[PDB]
């Protein structure tokens, strides 16, 4: 099944934040309405924040997270969770190798902001 794709409310600001846990350099691409809105590139094996940004979901609210290492797309797992019918987390994990820890790049999207 498709992973890393989320429908947000339109014209809504959200935060996106990436952590790294891999010897491989993680390239995180955040697409809004099928076009890149933010790109993070970093390397860490201890959960360093390689990027964080406030974006606007725009006209249709489609948000997609892509992760690649040395040009190879990682395998993604994702889900969205809503607390007290108001606070939203869209979660992404990714695996770039064979140990299947799926933490090599971890991306957390949260809204609303402000």
């Amino acid at each position: 099944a498709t992973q890393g794709v989320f429908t947000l409310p339109a014209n809504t600001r959200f935060g996106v934040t990436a952590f790294a846990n891999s010897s491989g350099t993680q390239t995180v691409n955040v697409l809004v309405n099928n076009e890149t809105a933010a790109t993070f590139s970093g390397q860490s094996t201890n959960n360093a924040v390689i990027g964080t940004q406030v974006l606007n979901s725009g006209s249709s609210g489609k948000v997609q997270v892509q992760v690649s290492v040395n040009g190879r797309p990682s395998d993604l797992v994702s889900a969205q969770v809503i607390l007290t019918n108001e606070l939203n987390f869209a979660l992404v994990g990714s695996e770039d190798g064979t140990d299947n820890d799926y933490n090599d790049a971890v991306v957390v999207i949260n809204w609303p902001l402000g």
């Binding site: 010897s23 350099t25 290492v69 040395n70 190798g97």
Partner: peptide
């Protein structure tokens, strides 16, 4: 540990 090295 192979993704780079």
């Amino acid at each position: 540990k192979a993704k780079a090295c």
